[PDB]
Amino acid sequence: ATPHINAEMGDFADVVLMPGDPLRAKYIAETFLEDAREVNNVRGMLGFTGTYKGRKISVMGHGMGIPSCSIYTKELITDFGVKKIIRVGSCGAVLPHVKLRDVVIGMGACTDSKVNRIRFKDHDFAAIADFDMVRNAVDAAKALGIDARVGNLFSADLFYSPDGEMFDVMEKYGILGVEMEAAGIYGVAAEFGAKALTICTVSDHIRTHEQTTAAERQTTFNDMIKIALESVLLGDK
Amino acid sequence: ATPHINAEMGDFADVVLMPGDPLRAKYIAETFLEDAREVNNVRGMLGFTGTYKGRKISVMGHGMGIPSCSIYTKELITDFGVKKIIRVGSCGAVLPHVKLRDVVIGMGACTDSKVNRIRFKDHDFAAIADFDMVRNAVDAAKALGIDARVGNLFSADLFYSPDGEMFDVMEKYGILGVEMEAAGIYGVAAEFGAKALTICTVSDHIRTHEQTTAAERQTTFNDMIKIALESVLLGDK
Amino acid sequence: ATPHINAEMGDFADVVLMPGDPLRAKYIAETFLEDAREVNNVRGMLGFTGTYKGRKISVMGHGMGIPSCSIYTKELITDFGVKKIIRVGSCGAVLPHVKLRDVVIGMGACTDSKVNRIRFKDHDFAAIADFDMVRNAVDAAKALGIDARVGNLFSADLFYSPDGEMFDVMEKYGILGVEMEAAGIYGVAAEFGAKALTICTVSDHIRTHEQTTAAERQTTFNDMIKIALESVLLGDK
Amino acid sequence: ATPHINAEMGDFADVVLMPGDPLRAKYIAETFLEDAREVNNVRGMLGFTGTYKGRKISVMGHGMGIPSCSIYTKELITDFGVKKIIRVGSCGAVLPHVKLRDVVIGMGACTDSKVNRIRFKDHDFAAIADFDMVRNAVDAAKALGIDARVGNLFSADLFYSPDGEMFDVMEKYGILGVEMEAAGIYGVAAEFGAKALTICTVSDHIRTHEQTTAAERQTTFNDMIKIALESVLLGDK
Amino acid sequence: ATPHINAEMGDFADVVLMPGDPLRAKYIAETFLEDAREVNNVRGMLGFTGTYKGRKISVMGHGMGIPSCSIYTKELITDFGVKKIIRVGSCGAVLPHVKLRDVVIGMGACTDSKVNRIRFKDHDFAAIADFDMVRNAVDAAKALGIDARVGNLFSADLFYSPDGEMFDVMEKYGILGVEMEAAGIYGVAAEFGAKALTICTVSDHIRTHEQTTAAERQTTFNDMIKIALESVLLGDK
Amino acid sequence: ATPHINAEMGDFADVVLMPGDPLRAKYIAETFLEDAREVNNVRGMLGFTGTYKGRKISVMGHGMGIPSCSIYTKELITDFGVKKIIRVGSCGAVLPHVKLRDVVIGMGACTDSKVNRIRFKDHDFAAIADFDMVRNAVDAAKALGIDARVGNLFSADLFYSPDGEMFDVMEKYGILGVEMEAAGIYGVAAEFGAKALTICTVSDHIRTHEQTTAAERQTTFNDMIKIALESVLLGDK
């Protein structure tokens, strides 16, 4: 066991899907995985392990923010033999052409966190996903008839930022989605020699706003999970 | 409602106790509060409101890390009229004389987060608690026969820090406990004009280690909550 | 003797009150201390030792700015056995409700100095007073019928700032007074294992021109000194 | 003409390959392009335009370092209608398993330059390549039977670093090659709304002395150029 | 009058020599100036105006540290018509071949203060003296047969630095003397539109800790003053 | 030979003049030097050695930007016995009273590069020229009846800066010319133990954008070269 995961080596698959919302883990397990078994409950961060088309997959929420997801992803990698982490979540958009419910794949993640500067002697660490994982997700999306955008996310420490002007800067430099985890997950992946990818669906436009329905949201969430799961199978080849 | 709290103005008391572990909220409500009612369930962050010796109190977990607790504390203050937040949690000790199960009260909180530099034009914001809340907790502890230490916490972004030498620096400068939230809560309190306090019990010594029992841990957790609750009553005068 | 203090161990009390102006230290000794003798005059930085209600007390100027006061406080602590420093100064106010002549107690001090980043591995050190000293000062003020606000000071390196915009930021985050020393003294206290407190009277407002009389201002200054001295007597018990 | 390029719109193709050495751009044009004409010689920074398998292509040196290449890439993009830049260079390796002659594709580039912090409000901009360009290069390499590693470069400001310790850090975080330009070019591409990719061949190792033959090294260099050129043809489709 | 100087336009010469110690300003006035009158004593910061060889000259202490001297130099420049400031101070040496009592002229000044970053948008401002003044001092020293080195000073915020290793870096980069003011005075001169020079005498050795006689101190102190005063006369021609 | 210069000890004079443009080095060799021989052409970075009035002199381009010139100056110093580097460059003016074709001498150089912070433990290193060299250039200019201003340059990493407002700050602080090298050359001179000076001719105005004739360019270019060359002769005496 580790400080935040009451489990033993072997309880997790070598691939873990991670939503921020812990309630989604059980949903994913019941909706997409066969023969799922409970493998963690510490702090209510429920974790499950089962199979998707015969392939062992685990799912466990990561909580909000870089510090939270950094804890879970580190423990998974160092103590549970996890090789790949796929964060599946939502993001806010700043680009006019990026629309609600679009699927965005973070090949890179900008951040205003200090965690990577702490790792990288106060220089600029480019927080990046594993390239094959990115391409697997793009290909899996295309096979499902979904076109996904690939580029930079911005991983914010403050959901409520006092710096209103930063959204304009994000937009100028082509940021596709704003969330709060990717750069931290990518940093941990590099630190401990594993691979990661963050996929998000656009839940908000920080410009236009203009909302959606619960059924549309569930459909889109399901699409994202299908993409993530099918992408793993392509990665296995 | 707010993005992370499905409730309305009035559903929360003007004082909120916040553990990191969401499972503790329900425990606190059932163990210490009368007539408790459920007021939030979004993302499983259960929130309750009831009374302690007639005084309205709410309890809701804040999740791990500065970004997570910054979201909840902000929403509580700006949308739910919350005036005081008391984080109640655990910390790791670096000072030899600070012992397992000691109660520590963070009058200040150091941090390696960038969130306060972002707020404060890249200068040093001293992240501090409300003084009366600190003194109320000290006095409430003394009335319960518990001596509490008052000083600086260190609010870490990385539970698993690559900088081993930082613990020595923390120790040199008198840091009483290491946790992951106080500086962020204090920053939000200052940003939105409210008051906050972080109280922690020492769960680990990052030096000696040397563990405890489950019964001892529960007793100590109960002591901390009693301190927090009684401290509120002193604050009311 | 030390490089900036021509005195020997025993010449100072274990508590030293410190105004910025050495002429003001002579004022304090003459006005409040019995049997006061000058114990330093190097660089004109007058220091005195005498008694207050039978208690040995010293008072000595610290000069203007963090680097100046850091020299004197360090030397007192490491070479003259000084355990407590109480800065007694003036500050400017930025908050509408903070008025000329208010007494402000710096439980914390923000700063644009780099000195604490230098001490603390480029992270945020919360420069704090000693809690018991703060409480003693609050209680002494109450006994004298004086209101005292407890919160953050801002210790500035530049009395004449190019960044007028920083005053709006201090106001936003609730800074009670602007001065030039507290964060430096609190950093020295932490570094060398002593205790400190800064008390100021508001001598100026950013907006402004409320003004008072010389007699009233000098009365309030004296009240600050009485609070400081009486706080020592409470600590002793 | 621009301040550093004496040419007119149309003189360049919409894709430009860029080695650091202008003598190497002449080499590439002579070796791989048909009907190549020199289109720039300002400051000796030779640029050429010709065809590869009937496709219009340009090649031009970028000089050494982020500031030099930032000038040329900006001017090409804003004044010569250039849509894609492919840097073709050499890099040093720090990872044991990365060998002399390996082909490295910089999906991201780390850096100790301040240029992106200047662009991005002092936060972390993940300097990334264009994903489709990365995929085109990976696919072209595969068609040529060449292995290509995709990951982070480190773009250094100082070829002769005082900080020997930074190489251990790059190695720890998995950097595939050290060069001097990629992060700068990726920053320009993002700023001015174009697309870029850096491909390097490993010319040196930190440890070391594996060595090869001139013929083999030059063969691998040519393979990098073929990968670059063929990647364009794949993008066109 | 200004907030720290009780005097009026005309009371100061257009050139002011400034040691850190007000008592030294007094010594300089008594020893070198004719018809010297005291023009300030606010905060004990003695200032005098007299003549040297018929030339009107002032001398006034500036206290210790960048924040202190920044106050006095600013006020002199903006409110007393002062055109040139010549700091005449002491410094500690780090270079083995720099000896006690050596005269050093700071054409530039390094610093660990944040003040110039605050002025210069967090970039590197090279804090430099006025060239004509440097040259005047060099020539005067030559006419007096006094040796003088020209180069970089380092202006420290912490006389008692916790970073002993930085002295190795100063030594590496050829720093001639460590003092606490020059870089701030140079930044004020630039901000407020005047001219400045810092001359120091090596009063201690940071490595050897070695010693001097009372007689030696102020005959060399005298050499520094003579250089400063004669340099003004050259500048006048 | 070194990695960027194919030559041997003795091929270069102990003084090297360096423009950014290799073609200008060629022009200088042909115009000012007798018996000039080409000693390098690696990367097209032409270098020549000849005599000026019997004095052995070299001239070689250093390319654009701090990283480029840092490579060449280092190699010359460590492997070719070069004692003095004189940059002879162009710059853009920000001050209204600085005119096209004005000659500026950088006694200091500000910068937005991180290179000196990397050298100087993230403090402010004042990047300064050798004083004797500055004085030699001033005197030579006077003997030639050529006006020359002495002061700060600013060495930019981005010729195309996204921060237009910084030019207001440079203007405020009296920056004489904006170029891209001086601060890096000065940092190399200090690191590797040689001497350096940057002289520039104002080739454009950053505000007016105004214009010059071909004839005007290189007669003033010529004035700069004459100053540099004659300054060496003075230094030799």
Side-chain angles (χ1 to χ4, degrees), chain A residues 1-98 100-237, chain B residues 1-98 100-237, chain C, chain D, chain E residues 1-98 100-236, chain F residues 1-98 100-236:
Chain A
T2 53
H4 308 84
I5 306 168
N6 182 19
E8 307 303 321
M9 174 64 79
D11 294 357
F12 289 83
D14 64 314
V15 177
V16 181
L17 266 59
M18 302 196 91
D21 179 358
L23 298 184
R24 283 307 202 181
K26 171 165 155 289
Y27 174 86
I28 290 162
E30 288 175 334
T31 310
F32 291 98
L33 303 187
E34 304 301 316
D35 304 312
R37 67 186 190 280
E38 184 184 322
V39 297
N40 183 49
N41 60 5
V42 175
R43 293 168 180 264
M45 205 62 80
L46 300 184
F48 302 90
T49 297
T51 56
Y52 180 71
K53 295 184 184 188
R55 152 44 129 158
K56 202 188 182 188
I57 298 286
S58 291
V59 54
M60 180 166 77
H62 57 60
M64 297 188 302
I66 282 167
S68 184
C69 66
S70 294
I71 283 167
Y72 291 101
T73 63
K74 185 287 189 184
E75 294 180 7
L76 286 172
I77 296 168
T78 64
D79 311 306
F80 296 97
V82 171
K83 297 301 186 48
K84 293 189 177 185
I85 288 157
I86 304 180
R87 161 178 154 59
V88 280
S90 59
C91 63
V94 298
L95 288 163
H97 47 273
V98 172
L100 284 196
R101 304 173 74 208
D102 279 0
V103 173
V104 168
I105 298 163
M107 177 167 90
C110 306
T111 188
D112 53 15
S113 175
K114 228 172 77 170
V115 291
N116 290 335
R117 295 200 189 168
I118 287 169
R119 289 176 172 113
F120 214 59
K121 289 199 67 175
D122 203 37
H123 303 307
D124 286 19
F125 178 72
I128 58 173
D130 175 78
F131 172 77
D132 284 345
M133 293 185 71
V134 176
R135 196 182 182 177
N136 295 338
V138 170
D139 288 348
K142 181 175 184 179
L144 292 160
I146 304 180
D147 213 287
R149 318 172 171 274
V150 181
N152 260 333
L153 296 169
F154 183 98
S155 295
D157 261 5
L158 293 176
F159 184 98
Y160 295 108
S161 176
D163 182 359
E165 169 194 345
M166 197 54 208
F167 294 127
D168 289 344
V169 178
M170 292 185 201
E171 179 180 354
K172 178 177 194 189
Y173 283 94
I175 277 57
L176 293 185
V178 186
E179 40 83 73
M180 299 178 60
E181 288 87 15
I185 294 180
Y186 298 167
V188 166
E191 184 172 359
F192 298 99
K195 299 175 174 175
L197 179 68
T198 299
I199 304 176
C200 295
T201 55
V202 176
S203 63
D204 188 33
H205 211 295
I206 309 181
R207 275 63 171 97
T208 324
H209 317 123
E210 194 167 307
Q211 197 43 228
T212 60
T213 84
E216 289 175 342
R217 291 195 292 283
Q218 186 183 4
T219 289
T220 292
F221 179 81
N222 284 341
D223 286 346
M224 167 166 59
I225 302 304
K226 292 170 187 171
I227 295 171
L229 288 171
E230 292 291 340
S231 87
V232 172
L233 305 184
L234 295 183
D236 290 337
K237 303 208 210 44
Chain B
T2 53
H4 308 84
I5 306 168
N6 182 19
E8 307 303 321
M9 174 64 79
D11 294 357
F12 289 83
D14 64 314
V15 177
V16 181
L17 266 59
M18 302 196 91
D21 179 358
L23 298 184
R24 283 307 202 181
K26 171 165 155 289
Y27 174 86
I28 290 162
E30 288 175 334
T31 310
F32 291 98
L33 303 187
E34 304 301 316
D35 304 312
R37 67 186 190 280
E38 184 184 322
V39 297
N40 183 49
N41 60 5
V42 175
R43 293 168 180 264
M45 205 62 80
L46 300 184
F48 302 90
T49 297
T51 56
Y52 180 71
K53 295 184 184 188
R55 152 44 129 158
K56 202 188 182 188
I57 298 286
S58 291
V59 54
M60 180 166 77
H62 57 60
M64 297 188 302
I66 282 167
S68 184
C69 66
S70 294
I71 283 167
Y72 291 101
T73 63
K74 185 287 189 184
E75 294 180 7
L76 286 172
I77 296 168
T78 64
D79 311 306
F80 296 97
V82 171
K83 297 301 186 48
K84 293 189 177 185
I85 288 157
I86 304 180
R87 161 178 154 59
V88 280
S90 59
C91 63
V94 298
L95 288 163
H97 47 273
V98 172
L100 284 196
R101 304 173 74 208
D102 279 0
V103 173
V104 168
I105 298 163
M107 177 167 90
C110 306
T111 188
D112 53 15
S113 175
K114 228 172 77 170
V115 291
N116 290 335
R117 295 200 189 168
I118 287 169
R119 289 176 172 113
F120 214 59
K121 289 199 67 175
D122 203 37
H123 303 307
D124 286 19
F125 178 72
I128 58 173
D130 175 78
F131 172 77
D132 284 345
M133 293 185 71
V134 176
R135 196 182 182 177
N136 295 338
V138 170
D139 288 348
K142 181 175 184 179
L144 292 160
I146 304 180
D147 213 287
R149 318 172 171 274
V150 181
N152 260 333
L153 296 169
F154 183 98
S155 295
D157 261 5
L158 293 176
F159 184 98
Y160 295 108
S161 176
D163 182 359
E165 169 194 345
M166 197 54 208
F167 294 127
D168 289 344
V169 178
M170 292 185 201
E171 179 180 354
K172 178 177 194 189
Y173 283 94
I175 277 57
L176 293 185
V178 186
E179 40 83 73
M180 299 178 60
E181 288 87 15
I185 294 180
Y186 298 167
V188 166
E191 184 172 359
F192 298 99
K195 299 175 174 175
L197 179 68
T198 299
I199 304 176
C200 295
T201 55
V202 176
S203 63
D204 188 33
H205 211 295
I206 309 181
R207 275 63 171 97
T208 324
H209 317 123
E210 194 167 307
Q211 197 43 228
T212 60
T213 84
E216 289 175 342
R217 291 195 292 283
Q218 186 183 4
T219 289
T220 292
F221 179 81
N222 284 341
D223 286 346
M224 167 166 59
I225 302 304
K226 292 170 187 171
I227 295 171
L229 288 171
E230 292 291 340
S231 87
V232 172
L233 305 184
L234 295 183
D236 290 337
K237 303 208 210 44
Chain C
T2 53
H4 305 90
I5 311 179
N6 187 15
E8 302 302 325
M9 178 69 77
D11 284 359
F12 293 89
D14 71 0
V15 184
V16 189
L17 272 65
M18 306 192 83
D21 177 0
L23 291 192
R24 194 56 72 169
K26 182 174 177 67
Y27 170 90
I28 293 164
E30 186 70 15
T31 300
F32 298 95
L33 302 184
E34 295 280 336
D35 304 330
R37 63 183 184 109
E38 188 187 278
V39 297
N40 182 57
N41 57 9
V42 175
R43 292 171 176 265
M45 196 61 64
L46 307 179
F48 303 86
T49 300
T51 58
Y52 181 77
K53 304 190 175 178
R55 212 280 190 204
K56 197 179 168 190
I57 297 286
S58 299
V59 55
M60 175 176 163
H62 63 49
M64 298 187 292
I66 281 163
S68 174
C69 71
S70 295
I71 284 167
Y72 293 110
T73 53
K74 187 281 193 188
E75 294 180 14
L76 291 170
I77 291 163
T78 66
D79 290 66
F80 294 94
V82 174
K83 307 283 185 182
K84 293 182 175 187
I85 301 285
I86 304 170
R87 167 166 153 70
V88 286
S90 64
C91 68
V94 291
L95 287 169
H97 51 292
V98 171
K99 307 302 184 64
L100 301 183
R101 302 174 72 221
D102 283 356
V103 173
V104 167
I105 297 173
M107 180 160 81
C110 303
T111 189
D112 54 11
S113 177
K114 234 171 70 167
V115 296
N116 290 332
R117 280 189 199 179
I118 288 170
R119 292 179 171 106
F120 209 59
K121 291 209 61 179
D122 203 40
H123 301 312
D124 288 16
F125 176 71
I128 61 173
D130 178 79
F131 164 81
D132 289 335
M133 292 183 70
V134 174
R135 185 177 47 183
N136 293 342
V138 165
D139 290 349
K142 191 193 170 183
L144 289 166
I146 307 193
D147 307 312
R149 308 169 170 283
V150 182
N152 260 333
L153 296 171
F154 181 98
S155 312
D157 267 357
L158 290 176
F159 187 92
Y160 299 103
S161 176
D163 187 3
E165 187 192 329
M166 198 50 208
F167 299 116
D168 290 344
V169 178
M170 302 181 205
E171 181 179 354
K172 179 171 179 168
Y173 293 92
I175 273 49
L176 301 180
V178 184
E179 44 82 75
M180 297 186 65
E181 291 87 12
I185 299 168
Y186 293 164
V188 163
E191 183 177 355
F192 297 94
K195 299 173 188 303
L197 178 66
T198 295
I199 311 169
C200 290
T201 64
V202 179
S203 288
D204 189 45
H205 209 290
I206 59 163
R207 62 127 214 150
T208 312
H209 312 114
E210 167 184 21
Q211 220 47 11
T212 47
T213 63
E216 295 173 298
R217 301 191 303 267
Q218 302 168 15
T219 299
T220 296
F221 182 89
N222 289 349
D223 274 330
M224 163 174 63
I225 307 303
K226 290 166 68 204
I227 286 159
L229 295 168
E230 293 286 340
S231 76
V232 176
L233 306 185
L234 290 173
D236 291 341
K237 300 192 309 191
Chain D
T2 53
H4 305 90
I5 311 179
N6 187 15
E8 302 302 325
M9 178 69 77
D11 284 359
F12 293 89
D14 71 0
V15 184
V16 189
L17 272 65
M18 306 192 83
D21 177 0
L23 291 192
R24 194 56 72 169
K26 182 174 177 67
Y27 170 90
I28 293 164
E30 186 70 15
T31 300
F32 298 95
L33 302 184
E34 295 280 336
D35 304 330
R37 63 183 184 109
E38 188 187 278
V39 297
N40 182 57
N41 57 9
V42 175
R43 292 171 176 265
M45 196 61 64
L46 307 179
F48 303 86
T49 300
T51 58
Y52 181 77
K53 304 190 175 178
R55 212 280 190 204
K56 197 179 168 190
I57 297 286
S58 299
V59 55
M60 175 176 163
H62 63 49
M64 298 187 292
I66 281 163
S68 174
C69 71
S70 295
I71 284 167
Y72 293 110
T73 53
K74 187 281 193 188
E75 294 180 14
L76 291 170
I77 291 163
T78 66
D79 290 66
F80 294 94
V82 174
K83 307 283 185 182
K84 293 182 175 187
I85 301 285
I86 304 170
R87 167 166 153 70
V88 286
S90 64
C91 68
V94 291
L95 287 169
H97 51 292
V98 171
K99 307 302 184 64
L100 301 183
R101 302 174 72 221
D102 283 356
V103 173
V104 167
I105 297 173
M107 180 160 81
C110 303
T111 189
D112 54 11
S113 177
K114 234 171 70 167
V115 296
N116 290 332
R117 280 189 199 179
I118 288 170
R119 292 179 171 106
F120 209 59
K121 291 209 61 179
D122 203 40
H123 301 312
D124 288 16
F125 176 71
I128 61 173
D130 178 79
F131 164 81
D132 289 335
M133 292 183 70
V134 174
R135 185 177 47 183
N136 293 342
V138 165
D139 290 349
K142 191 193 170 183
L144 289 166
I146 307 193
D147 307 312
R149 308 169 170 283
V150 182
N152 260 333
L153 296 171
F154 181 98
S155 312
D157 267 357
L158 290 176
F159 187 92
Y160 299 103
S161 176
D163 187 3
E165 187 192 329
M166 198 50 208
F167 299 116
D168 290 344
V169 178
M170 302 181 205
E171 181 179 354
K172 179 171 179 168
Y173 293 92
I175 273 49
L176 301 180
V178 184
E179 44 82 75
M180 297 186 65
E181 291 87 12
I185 299 168
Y186 293 164
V188 163
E191 183 177 355
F192 297 94
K195 299 173 188 303
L197 178 66
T198 295
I199 311 169
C200 290
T201 64
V202 179
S203 288
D204 189 45
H205 209 290
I206 59 163
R207 62 127 214 150
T208 312
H209 312 114
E210 167 184 21
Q211 220 47 11
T212 47
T213 63
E216 295 173 298
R217 301 191 303 267
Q218 302 168 15
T219 299
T220 296
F221 182 89
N222 289 349
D223 274 330
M224 163 174 63
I225 307 303
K226 290 166 68 204
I227 286 159
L229 295 168
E230 293 286 340
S231 76
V232 176
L233 306 185
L234 290 173
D236 291 341
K237 300 192 309 191
Chain E
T2 54
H4 305 82
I5 308 175
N6 189 17
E8 306 302 322
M9 181 68 72
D11 288 354
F12 287 90
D14 67 352
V15 181
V16 187
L17 273 58
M18 308 189 82
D21 180 355
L23 299 187
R24 284 315 168 269
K26 185 188 185 70
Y27 169 89
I28 290 158
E30 300 174 340
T31 309
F32 291 96
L33 302 185
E34 311 186 71
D35 300 323
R37 58 187 199 272
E38 185 181 301
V39 293
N40 180 65
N41 192 39
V42 172
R43 288 168 180 270
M45 198 56 66
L46 295 163
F48 307 83
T49 299
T51 56
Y52 176 79
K53 302 189 178 178
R55 166 58 147 108
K56 193 182 174 184
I57 293 294
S58 300
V59 54
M60 180 176 163
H62 58 49
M64 297 189 299
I66 281 168
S68 181
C69 67
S70 292
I71 285 161
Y72 296 110
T73 50
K74 182 281 184 187
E75 293 180 7
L76 291 171
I77 293 163
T78 61
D79 286 75
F80 295 97
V82 173
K83 307 294 183 65
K84 296 179 182 191
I85 302 281
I86 302 176
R87 169 171 150 66
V88 287
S90 58
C91 64
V94 291
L95 294 164
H97 62 282
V98 172
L100 289 192
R101 293 188 300 109
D102 277 1
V103 169
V104 304
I105 302 168
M107 182 181 33
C110 303
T111 189
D112 55 11
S113 172
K114 231 171 84 168
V115 301
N116 294 333
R117 292 197 192 173
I118 286 163
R119 289 173 173 117
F120 211 59
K121 217 118 108 87
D122 201 41
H123 301 317
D124 286 21
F125 174 74
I128 57 165
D130 176 81
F131 171 77
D132 287 335
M133 294 183 63
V134 172
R135 184 174 48 176
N136 294 336
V138 170
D139 292 346
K142 189 196 173 195
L144 294 161
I146 302 170
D147 287 341
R149 295 195 187 78
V150 183
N152 263 152
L153 295 170
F154 181 95
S155 304
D157 266 1
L158 293 178
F159 184 100
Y160 296 104
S161 177
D163 189 2
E165 198 278 339
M166 183 70 193
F167 294 119
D168 298 344
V169 178
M170 296 183 206
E171 180 172 4
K172 172 67 177 168
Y173 280 89
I175 276 45
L176 300 177
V178 183
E179 43 84 79
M180 304 180 55
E181 291 89 9
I185 295 172
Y186 296 164
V188 166
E191 180 177 348
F192 291 96
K195 298 170 173 178
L197 176 67
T198 297
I199 308 171
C200 290
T201 292
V202 178
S203 69
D204 55 280
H205 207 292
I206 289 167
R207 272 74 167 74
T208 78
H209 305 301
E210 107 140 302
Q211 63 173 174
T212 53
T213 284
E216 283 163 350
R217 286 194 264 300
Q218 298 212 173
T219 161
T220 314
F221 173 87
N222 287 338
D223 288 342
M224 170 173 66
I225 302 311
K226 294 179 191 177
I227 291 174
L229 292 174
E230 292 293 335
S231 80
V232 177
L233 299 188
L234 294 177
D236 289 335
Chain F
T2 54
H4 305 82
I5 308 175
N6 189 17
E8 306 302 322
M9 181 68 72
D11 288 354
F12 287 90
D14 67 352
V15 181
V16 187
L17 273 58
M18 308 189 82
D21 180 355
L23 299 187
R24 284 315 168 269
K26 185 188 185 70
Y27 169 89
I28 290 158
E30 300 174 340
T31 309
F32 291 96
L33 302 185
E34 311 186 71
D35 300 323
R37 58 187 199 272
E38 185 181 301
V39 293
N40 180 65
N41 192 39
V42 172
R43 288 168 180 270
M45 198 56 66
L46 295 163
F48 307 83
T49 299
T51 56
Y52 176 79
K53 302 189 178 178
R55 166 58 147 108
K56 193 182 174 184
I57 293 294
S58 300
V59 54
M60 180 176 163
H62 58 49
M64 297 189 299
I66 281 168
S68 181
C69 67
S70 292
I71 285 161
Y72 296 110
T73 50
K74 182 281 184 187
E75 293 180 7
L76 291 171
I77 293 163
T78 61
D79 286 75
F80 295 97
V82 173
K83 307 294 183 65
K84 296 179 182 191
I85 302 281
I86 302 176
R87 169 171 150 66
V88 287
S90 58
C91 64
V94 291
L95 294 164
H97 62 282
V98 172
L100 289 192
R101 293 188 300 109
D102 277 1
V103 169
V104 304
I105 302 168
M107 182 181 33
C110 303
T111 189
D112 55 11
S113 172
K114 231 171 84 168
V115 301
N116 294 333
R117 292 197 192 173
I118 286 163
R119 289 173 173 117
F120 211 59
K121 217 118 108 87
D122 201 41
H123 301 317
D124 286 21
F125 174 74
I128 57 165
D130 176 81
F131 171 77
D132 287 335
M133 294 183 63
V134 172
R135 184 174 48 176
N136 294 336
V138 170
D139 292 346
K142 189 196 173 195
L144 294 161
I146 302 170
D147 287 341
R149 295 195 187 78
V150 183
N152 263 152
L153 295 170
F154 181 95
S155 304
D157 266 1
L158 293 178
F159 184 100
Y160 296 104
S161 177
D163 189 2
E165 198 278 339
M166 183 70 193
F167 294 119
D168 298 344
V169 178
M170 296 183 206
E171 180 172 4
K172 172 67 177 168
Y173 280 89
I175 276 45
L176 300 177
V178 183
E179 43 84 79
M180 304 180 55
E181 291 89 9
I185 295 172
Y186 296 164
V188 166
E191 180 177 348
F192 291 96
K195 298 170 173 178
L197 176 67
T198 297
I199 308 171
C200 290
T201 292
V202 178
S203 69
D204 55 280
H205 207 292
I206 289 167
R207 272 74 167 74
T208 78
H209 305 301
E210 107 140 302
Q211 63 173 174
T212 53
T213 284
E216 283 163 350
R217 286 194 264 300
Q218 298 212 173
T219 161
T220 314
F221 173 87
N222 287 338
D223 288 342
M224 170 173 66
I225 302 311
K226 294 179 191 177
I227 291 174
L229 292 174
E230 292 293 335
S231 80
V232 177
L233 299 188
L234 294 177
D236 289 335

